[PDB]
Write a protein that binds this ligand. Structure first.
Ligand code: CLA
Ligand code: CLA
Ligand code: CLA
Ligand code: CLA
Ligand code: CLA
Ligand code: CLA
Ligand code: CLA
Ligand SMILES: CC1=C(C#C/C(C)=C/C=C/C(C)=C/C=C/C=C(C)/C=C/C=C(\C)C#CC2=C(C)C[C@@H](O)CC2(C)C)C(C)(C)C[C@H](O)C1
Ligand SMILES: CC1=C(C#C/C(C)=C/C=C/C(C)=C/C=C/C=C(C)/C=C/C=C(\C)C#CC2=C(C)C[C@@H](O)CC2(C)C)C(C)(C)C[C@H](O)C1
Ligand SMILES: CC1=C(C#C/C(C)=C/C=C/C(C)=C/C=C/C=C(C)/C=C/C=C(C)/C=C/C2=C(C)CCCC2(C)C)C(C)(C)C[C@H](O)C1
Ligand SMILES: CC1=C(C#C/C(C)=C/C=C/C(C)=C/C=C/C=C(C)/C=C/C=C(C)/C=C/C2=C(C)CCCC2(C)C)C(C)(C)C[C@H](O)C1
Lengths: 90, 180, 172
């Protein structure tokens, strides 16, 4: 009804192709599909290992294993980015 | 062809170092050939180091290790150093050091194996590591096949050495010297 | 192709004109972040690490008057704890935070592009009035800073094992 503002750097992200344009990856638009795929497995293995090491949680947990455990959900976003880049030829 | 019965798939090109028509099980149809070539060169080099180290860890040992390792042979040394490091011991971190540096090397050389599959300039296994220049200045290509043959032999040899230890406590030299 | 890593392809965001260029970006980190942000960050890490390395060495060699009775044994990072109970570390924190508020502003115009990475125009003495000696000093700043980052890691980590501190660890 009046112009709706968006932050500067807003671009069009609507896609009807096989994969979205690499612009949907933000700062990771130039990373290769191999680099996400290897990061995806690495984050999954390290994240699972760190998660596994603190499953009985104590009042003194290792803070690196807590921080390293956040790599497991982060790996999910990594393989999605790996699939997007592979299907954009990157 | 290596096996007249079952020849190699047409997926394998015949211009690769070490191509001797050997793929009866068609394992190059089940994966990328560039990945497989890279994997076998890496397996070859790791196994060459493992085999030479198995022989050397018998003929001559680095100073001081007998207090940290005793008389354990090839598989045992790994377990015992990691046992000593499991206490807080400073002088038993050889395993963590080698794992760190090899992991760091595989981390920073990791984009190479994806560039080769993506059509990149570099051929499988080539890191341009020729400090002495012996292979480069001289005509190269025989050394590739020598590397591949020695690497395949090293893989089988590591297999032998390890499993011979897993049965009898002898290492390489002890097991070869006699015949139980 | 890349200079430092011959197997790897040349980093797309990295160019020869930039100081301390060896074509070294195996992980392609320059593609992820804005290059000017990384360049300012490298220079900032370099200059703090040079101060830290010289500080480690000098704190081995001599100590300022009266510090011996505030802190007796602690040498590398143990002093930090003793002085946080006192007010020394807090005072340095406050004044570096002042300088880093103006560094926040400075980084904003760097991202606007009107300021070069690491360029604070702080050249009181006449050491950059050639634009040939300036480029050599630019390269030497980057290289000595990188060496200082690795050295600061080696000095503190050596203290973590031994507690000796750098030059004492050298002597014994
Ligand atoms: C399921 C949730 C989700 C998903 C898919 C993403 C996905 C992404 N985020 Mg977002 N983000 C999230 C939650 C999420 N974020 C949350 C909870 C926060 C708050 C801490 C942020 C704050 C955040 C910031 C501040 C930025 C991103 C950025 C990015 C992109 C960087 C990709 C990358 O690192 O490449 C390698 C990517 C599109 C970056 C970007 O480019 O955004 C478009 C960026 O600058 N994220
Ligand atoms: C980790 C083990 C490993 C791997 C991945 C490979 C991989 C490969 N070999 Mg090698 N090879 C090995 C061990 C291995 N080899 C050993 C131990 C021997 C000796 C007993 C051989 C002897 C050999 C010959 C003689 C030939 C190959 C060939 C091949 C290729 C065919 C694809 C294939 O069969 O995949 C195999 C995957 C697994 C076995 C796993 C491929 C590059 C053929 C080729 O094209 O040369 C490069 C070929 O002619 N290999
Ligand atoms: C798979 C490889 C492998 C593994 C896991 C081990 C692991 C071990 N070795 Mg064995 N060793 C190896 C290879 C290996 N070694 C090789 C190749 C040699 C030389 C023939 C030796 C000779 C050796 C001796 C003499 C001794 C050990 C010992 C040990 C233990 C302590 C660590 C140590 O000092 O290593 C020492 C290992 C080396 C000095 C190997 C360095 C050789 C490098 C790899 C050559 C690299 C060349 C090139 C420049 C690098 C390529 C760069 C390129 C990739 C960019 C540990 C169990 C000690 C022990 O307690 O055993 C009882 C011991 O006394 N090793
Ligand atoms: C490059 C390989 C290398 C070299 C040159 C040496 C050299 C030496 N070691 Mg050995 N050592 C090595 C690898 C090596 N080490 C490895 C890989 C381990 C196990 C992780 C050990 C564990 C070890 C112990 C536990 C001790 C030595 C000690 C020593 C020193 C005295 C010699 C001795 O006691 O006999 C000697 C300089 C002794 C030492 O420091 O005494 C001064 C000693 O106590 N070494
Ligand atoms: C049989 C051994 C052998 C052979 C013939 C080759 C041959 C080659 N390698 Mg490979 N390599 C090997 C083992 C070998 N390598 C091992 C074990 C490693 C792991 C450290 C590597 C790591 C490696 C990398 C990372 C690269 C090569 C490359 C190359 C090529 C050019 C370099 C060159 O000509 O050097 C010739 C090498 C030799 C003649 C090996 C010297 C062996 C000496 C004579 C004895 C070894 C002593 C050893 C420590 C064990 C002692 C005995 C023990 C029982 C005590 C060529 C195909 C490069 C390439 O493909 O592109 C250019 C490359 O980037 N290699
Ligand atoms: C916190 C430390 C830090 C930071 C932010 C940087 C940042 C940078 N470095 Mg430097 N570098 C450092 C430490 C650091 N470096 C150290 C300790 C060394 C010595 C090993 C080097 C050696 C080095 C070389 C040889 C080169 C770079 C290059 C680069 C740039 C691209 C690579 C990149 O994204 O790296 C991000 C790294 C981290 C976040 C860690 C970027 C400006 C390249 C360039 O073009 O320079 C302008 C280049 O050629 N660096
Ligand atoms: C964070 C740094 C720091 C700290 C904690 C101290 C702490 C102290 N200084 Mg000070 N001092 C410092 C830096 C510092 N100094 C600097 C940078 C200088 C200039 C070089 C001085 C110059 C100085 C003088 C001249 C004197 C002290 C003295 C003293 C001590 C007075 C009580 C005593 O020991 O008797 C006190 C503990 C007194 C002292 O005992 O020195 C012998 C004294 O007279 N200080
Ligand atoms: C590349 C390159 C460089 C380099 C380099 C390097 C590190 C080169 C190293 C090459 C090496 C280490 C080759 C070793 C291969 C080992 C083999 C073939 C063993 C097979 C075992 C068998 C057959 C067995 C056995 C058996 C026995 C005896 C004992 C029994 O109990 C067990 C069993 C019965 C099984 C340099 C630095 C030169 C620069 C250059 O510019 C580029
Ligand atoms: C004049 C002035 C200017 C200025 C300025 C200033 C203050 C410039 C100061 C620059 C500094 C502080 C440079 C110091 C670098 C230290 C390095 C490279 C460390 C090397 C150590 C190594 C290799 C090691 C080690 C060690 C290990 C790890 C463990 C130890 O056990 C052993 C050991 C010690 C051997 C500016 C530009 C601001 C403007 C204007 O012009 C006015
Ligand atoms: C130290 C360490 C560990 C470890 C470990 C390791 C390294 C274990 C070793 C694993 C290996 C390398 C096994 C080898 C398998 C190769 C075989 C069976 C050869 C088949 C070839 C055949 C049948 C025929 C070949 C042929 C011949 C006859 C010639 C004609 C052609 C052909 C028909 C192809 C543990 C587990 C102890 C744990 C410990 O905490 C850390
Ligand atoms: C003040 C205070 C503290 C503190 C503190 C401090 C000062 C902490 C500082 C920590 C630092 C500076 C760590 C740096 C580590 C550097 C590394 C791992 C580089 C490795 C190089 C690699 C892997 C490869 C290099 C490479 C090789 C060789 C070949 C290829 C090329 C190259 C890339 C050069 C505490 C925590 C004690 C608490 C206390 O209450 C208050």
């Amino acid at each position: 009804f009046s112009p709706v503002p968006s932050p500067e750097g807003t671009k069009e992200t609507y896609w009807e192709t096989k994969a979205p344009s690499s612009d949907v990856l933000g700062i990771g638009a130039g990373v290769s599909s191999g680099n996400f795929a290897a990061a995806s497995v690495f984050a999954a293995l390290v994240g699972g290992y760190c998660t596994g090491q603190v499953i009985p949680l104590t009042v003194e947990p290792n803070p690196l294993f807590l921080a390293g455990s956040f790599l497991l959900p982060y790996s999910w976003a990594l393989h999605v980015a790996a699939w997007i880049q592979k299907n954009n030829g990157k | 062809r290596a096996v007249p019965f079952a020849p190699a798939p047409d997926c394998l090109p015949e211009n690769i170092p070490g191509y001797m028509g050997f793929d009866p099980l068609g394992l190059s149809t089940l994966c990328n050939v560039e990945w497989l070539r890279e994997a076998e060169i890496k397996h070859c080099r790791v196994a060459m180091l493992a085999a030479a180290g198995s022989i050397a860890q018998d003929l001559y040992q680095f100073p001081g290790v007998e207090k940290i390792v005793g008389s354990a042979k090839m598989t045992g040394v790994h377990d015992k150093i990691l046992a000593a490091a499991s206490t807080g011991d400073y002088k038993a971190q050889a395993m963590s050091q080698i794992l760190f540096w090899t992991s760091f090397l595989e981390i920073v050389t990791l984009p190479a194996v994806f560039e080769t599959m993506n059509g990149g300039p570099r051929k499988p296994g080539v890191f341009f590591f020729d400090p002495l220049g012996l292979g480069k200045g001289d005509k190269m290509g025989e050394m590739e096949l020598k590397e591949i043959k020695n690497g395949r032999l090293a893989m089988i040899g590591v297999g032998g050495m390890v499993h011979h230890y897993l049965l009898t406590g002898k290492g390489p030299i002890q097991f070869l010297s006699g015949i139980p | 192709m890349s200079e430092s890593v011959p197997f790897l392809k040349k980093p797309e965001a990295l160019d020869s004109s930039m100081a301390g260029y060896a074509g070294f970006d195996p992980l392609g980190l320059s593609s992820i972040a804005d290059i000017k942000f990384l360049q300012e960050s490298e220079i900032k890490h370099c200059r703090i690490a040079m101060l830290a390395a010289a500080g480690s060495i000098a704190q081995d060699i001599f100590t300022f008057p009266g510090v011996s009775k505030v802190v007796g044994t602690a040498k590398m990072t143990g002093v930090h704890d003793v002085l946080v109970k006192q007010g020394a570390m807090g005072q340095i924190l406050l004044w570096t935070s002042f300088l880093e508020v103006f560094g926040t502003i400075a980084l904003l115009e760097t991202l606007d592009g009107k300021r070069a990475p690491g360029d604070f125009k702080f050249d009181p003495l006449g050491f950059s009035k050639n634009a040939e000696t300036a480029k050599r000093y630019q390269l030497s700043e980057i290289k000595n800073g990188r060496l200082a980052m690795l050295a600061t890691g080696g000095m503190v980590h050596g203290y973590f094992i031994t507690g000796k501190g750098p030059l004492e660890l050298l002597t014994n």
